[PDB]
Write a protein that binds this ligand. Sequence first.
Ligand SMILES: N[C@@H](CCCC[NH3+])C(=O)O
Ligand SMILES: N[C@@H](CCCC[NH3+])C(=O)O
Lengths: 295, 296
Amino acid sequence: NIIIGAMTALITPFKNGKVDEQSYARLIKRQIENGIDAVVPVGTTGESATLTWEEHRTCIEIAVETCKGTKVKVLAGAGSNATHEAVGLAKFAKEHGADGILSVAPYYNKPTQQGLYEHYKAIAQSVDIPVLLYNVPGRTGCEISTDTIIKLFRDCENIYGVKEASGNIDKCVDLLAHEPRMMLISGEDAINYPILSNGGKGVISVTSNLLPDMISALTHFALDENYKEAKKINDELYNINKILFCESNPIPIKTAMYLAGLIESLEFRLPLCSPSKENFAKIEEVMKKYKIKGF
Amino acid sequence: KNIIIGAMTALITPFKNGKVDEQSYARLIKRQIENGIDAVVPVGTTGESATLTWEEHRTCIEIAVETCKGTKVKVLAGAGSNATHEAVGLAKFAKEHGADGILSVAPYYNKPTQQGLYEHYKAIAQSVDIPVLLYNVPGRTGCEISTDTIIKLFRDCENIYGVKEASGNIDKCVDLLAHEPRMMLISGEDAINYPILSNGGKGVISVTSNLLPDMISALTHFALDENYKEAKKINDELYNINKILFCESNPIPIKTAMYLAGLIESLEFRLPLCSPSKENFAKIEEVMKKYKIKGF
Ligand SMILES: N[C@@H](CCCC[NH3+])C(=O)O
Ligand SMILES: N[C@@H](CCCC[NH3+])C(=O)O
């Protein structure tokens, strides 16, 4: 009982300080129409930290209602540095039609490996839908060790894999060599193919917000072991994959979506803000080299 | 500039049956007041601010301002958040409820840019009229408030008067005070309290002061009196306990020490925080033996 394939960490477009819910549904439809397998509402790319609870819940509802009749699954962003908050988000996502949940490792409080095990066990025991771990130590300040990830996969029936955003291909080999039954998901666009070629079964992408057809083609070429095609797209996408992180995600990707005319206003919620005027031109310069799909 | 300096304690938040033990909390603050502590920091990183509800976060601030009232011990209320609107709400509550100042941690997880950090703290400083002390701890937040950003906020905002550094970078400490000697650098790292104070730091926000407030206060006050021989001596004596209090993630070791010292009733954390390992439980207990722990 898995959620795999090409997935998009959806941005959360704002307009006049409010979630633009019409653009939000429209962007998800654009993902559905270009071969995306799942959408991740209210992730790191979705500015989950500055959204209220009612906005976090609304973006989940818009994702589930848009994907009805489609196979874009909804891996609802339900992570938190407080276990009771993460259990509450997991319980909401289940009761409102989400196919699974993405649960980021607790940030700022830096739990121990024992605490991470108990944190995700409480989340996994509160629902009966798949739970995908999310490891990003550069943002959280903590690391879910390989041993902890493997234990959670084997002890909790709904925990089926991990979204790795650590730039450590050695750990990816370590995970699948010792536990080949888990679903390793790439959370780093620049190394999507190396993660997929070693046995990864999907991506949760930032670049797919701008180029969903290319991320989708890459992931599915890799899943069919057509590595000559999968690597080609991964190499061609490297420049945009790196320039989308010249500043902290999701500042560059939202700037690109605005430059592509896909969102109406380049609005962030503080402490996030607009990029520099130099980076504004660099992102626009890199975008001119790629085929950006419309609506 | 209105300042809050000296020896300060990042108060732990004791729980009992899943609720904040408020009688124990006010008793811990009195013990801090009675051992020469100049200010208390409610609901910091040590106070498990991430797992406290909004009502519990507000309650601990209220208890701190009430326990310290009638004394010169100030309340530097923890009011940080990775959401600017959340941090502004916390700053406004602390103001309207008697806090002398606020401690505002750098936004975690979302990693704001240097421009975003400036606008974040500018909005906080303009929302309140009490002193604002920045809090830099890159190992926990994933971002760093650069020296240039800290100095800009200090010079552009009336209420921004310094920073709590928890970065293990004494080079940065020299950088701050060499270019802006009027700021109040506060040590957020117990093991290097004296080196920060000897270069011009004006106080500490301590984890070890929960267990040994008399020693942290004496250390800070020796340094402020330029008695660097006695300040370093205590800093050296405290090195073993200062490091064992971080053998696991704060506040797991300090709460274990407070429990082992009989200062709190139950060794209760709120998930994802939990009790330390068996070996670390013994290591903390062994290091505690070499120190005189004050009672109530
Ligand atoms: N500052 C809080 C807000 C959570 C709102 C719901 N995602 C956090 O990032 O954990
Ligand atoms: N867990 C969230 C919400 C905290 C709310 C105030 N205690 C955070 O760390 O920001």
